[PDB]
Amino acid sequence: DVPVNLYRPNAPFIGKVISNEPLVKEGGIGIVQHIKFDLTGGNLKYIEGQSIGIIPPGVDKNGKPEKLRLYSIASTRHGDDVDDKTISLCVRQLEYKHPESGETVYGVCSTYLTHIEPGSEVKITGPVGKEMLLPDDPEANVIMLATGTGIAPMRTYLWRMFKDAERAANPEYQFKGFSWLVFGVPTTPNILYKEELEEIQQKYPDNFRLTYAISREQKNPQGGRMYIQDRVAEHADQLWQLIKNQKTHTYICGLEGMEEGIDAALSAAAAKEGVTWSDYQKDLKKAGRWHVETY
Numbered sequence: 001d002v003p004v005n006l007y008r009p010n011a012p013f014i015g016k017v018i019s020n021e022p023l024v025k026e027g028g029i030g031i032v033q034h035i036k037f038d039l040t041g042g043n044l045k046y047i048e049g050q051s052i053g054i055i056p057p058g059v060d061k062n063g064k065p066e067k068l069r070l071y072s073i074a075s076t077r078h079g080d081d082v083d084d085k086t087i088s089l090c091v092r093q094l095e096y097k098h099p100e101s102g103e104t105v106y107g108v109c110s111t112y113l114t115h116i117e118p119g120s121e122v123k124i125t126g127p128v129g130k131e132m133l134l135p136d137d138p139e140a141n142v143i144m145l146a147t148g149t150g151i152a153p154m155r156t157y158l159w160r161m162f163k164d165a166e167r168a169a170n171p172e173y174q175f176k177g178f179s180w181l182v183f184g185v186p187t188t189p190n191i192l193y194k195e196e197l198e199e200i201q202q203k204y205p206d207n208f209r210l211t212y213a214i215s216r217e218q219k220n221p222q223g224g225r226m227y228i229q230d231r232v233a234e235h236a237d238q239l240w241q242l243i244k245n246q247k248t249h250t251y252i253c254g255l256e257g258m259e260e261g262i263d264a265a266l267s268a269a270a271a272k273e274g275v276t277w278s279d280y281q282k283d284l285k286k287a288g289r290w291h292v293e294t295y
């Protein structure tokens with residue numbers, strides 16, 4: 001009943017770029033684009049929390065065709081315009097060091113996507129993923145722990161929960177639980193969707209809490225840069241409390257290696273009550289209340 005693999009790599013959907021807009025403001029690090037695609041003509045359906053594949057043009061440094069890369073869907077099932085006709089992605093351009101054969105490497109698919117023009121056709125596969133789905137229970141608590149482009153799934157949840165047009169379109173889901181986004185980025189110009197996140201937090205002060213960890217502007221208690229694990233350690237007790245509720249779901253998304261500082265913070269909070277976190281967490285995973293997607 002969750003749509004999966006409506007389109008596959010041997011016969012992808014050919015969508016058209018509608019728009020490609022920058023999300024990183026002046027003064028920020030790197031390039032992150034919000035890219036919307038037109039889905040009319042195909043039967044690509046998807047829900048919140050899933051990914052799609054993009055097949056980039058070209059051959060690797062071997063003569064072999066490029067393989068797909070997966071991207072978290074950044075729009076709800078209805079699209080940004082709530083018309084059931086489009087799909088959006090949140091794509092950071094990958095590039096890294098000079099001292100690295102050839103010197104200065106650009107990711108193939110992320111560079112392709114971040115510089116793609118309106119009107120261009122793209123090969124799209126999917127949707128894929130059953131690990132990051134939102135419960136259809138409007139009384140759920142939803143903890144969201146994101147870094148960088150890991151905001152993408154979180155945006156689909158929050159938009160479904162709190163956008164007026166979404167609430168009008170989803171009569172069956174009128175969110176009245178509590179949700180808390182902890183969001184780690186390097187700078188304030190790097191806070192993707194900042195204006196819309198803060199608009200939500202102002203309309204729904206009792207239903208949404210927003211916490212940033214901005215490493216180039218904030219210091220942790222040890223004098224280091226503020227990262228998301230520092231913010232989690234700061235609120236570990238109240239995060240642990242919320243996690244004990246049977247209705248609480250926790251989502252973690254972003255670049256790999258964020259999961260370990262989060263566990264250490266929740267281990268110390270759980271230990272105060274004679275619980276072993278790593279054992280409790282295994283149970284949460286089995287129950288489908290612990291959702292992780294890192295890359």
Ligand SMILES: Cc1cc2nc3c(=O)[nH]c(=O)nc-3n(C[C@H](O)[C@H](O)[C@H](O)COP(=O)(O)OP(=O)(O)OC[C@H]3O[C@@H](n4cnc5c(N)ncnc54)[C@H](O)[C@@H]3O)c2cc1C
Pocket residue numbers: 051069070071072073090091092093094096097106107108109110111149150152293294295
């Ligand atoms: C489920 C899932 C969801 C994802 N969602 C998103 C999303 O929403 N937004 C997004 O931007 N990305 C997302 N990603 C990553 C996206 O999969 C592509 O991997 C990423 O965009 C880079 O692809 P590329 O094609 O640009 O690069 P490539 O050209 O394939 O480069 C990747 C390779 O270069 C190397 N490399 C990367 N970084 C470094 C470094 N610092 N130092 C040295 N070598 C390095 C590695 O060998 C890696 O295999 C997601 C991945 C998965 C698995």
